[PDB]
C-alpha cells in the first residue's frame, strides 16, 4: 500500500491538505505508524521548487506534494484509501532523495 492515496480525515487540516500519500515500504507494514506526504491543491498555491515539490495530476485534481511537510502518522488515520500514485513513484521518491541529499 506504499503510494496509496488517502483522503484527509483530520478536519483541522483537510481544507489545505485534502489528501496524503503513504511513502513507506510495504516490507515494514508491521509498524503501527506510516510515513506520509500531504497534497495541497495547486490552484490553492500561487510555483514552488519543482525538485522539492512534485506536481501530481490525478482524477481527484491537480496537486503539489509538500515533501517538506512529510511526517510519521498513526496507521489509524489511513482510514479512507481512494487512489494510488505508483505512476509517480519515481517523482515522489526523488523528492525525498532531494530533501535528504540535495541531489
Amino acid at each position: 500500500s506504499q503510494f496509496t492515496l488517502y483522503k484527509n480525515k483530520d478536519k483541522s487540516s483537510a481544507k489545505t491538505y485534502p489528501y496524503f500519500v503513504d511513502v513507506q515500504s510495504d516490507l515494514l507494514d508491521n509498524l503501527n505508524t506510516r510515513l506520509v506526504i500531504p497534497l495541497t491543491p495547486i490552484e490553492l498555491l500561487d510555483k514552488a521548487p519543482s525538485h522539492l515539490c512534485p506536481t501530481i495530476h490525478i482524477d481527484e485534481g491537480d496537486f503539489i506534494m509538500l515533501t517538506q511537510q512529510m511526517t510519521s502518522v498513526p496507521v489509524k488515520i489511513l482510514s479512507e484509501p481512494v487512489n494510488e500514485l505508483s505512476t509517480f513513484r519515481n517523482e515522489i521518491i526523488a523528492a525525498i532523495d532531494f530533501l535528504i541529499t540535495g541531489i
Binding site: 483541522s12 487540516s13 496524503f20 500531504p38 498555491l45 514552488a48 511537510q69 512529510m70 511526517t71
Partner: protein, 33 residues
C-alpha cells in the same frame, strides 16, 4: 554553486513558507509524538 542555487530558489521557498504559515502545517497537526 550551492549558494547560488539557494539564492535562485529563495523566493520559491519563501512563498511556500508564507503559504504554510497562512494555511497551517500538516506535520504539526498529524505528527505522532
Amino acid at each position: 554553486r550551492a549558494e547560488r542555487w539557494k539564492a535562485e530558489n529563495q523566493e520559491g521557498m519563501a512563498e511556500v513558507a508564507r503559504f504554510i504559515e497562512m494555511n497551517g502545517s500538516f506535520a504539526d497537526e498529524n505528527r505522532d509524538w
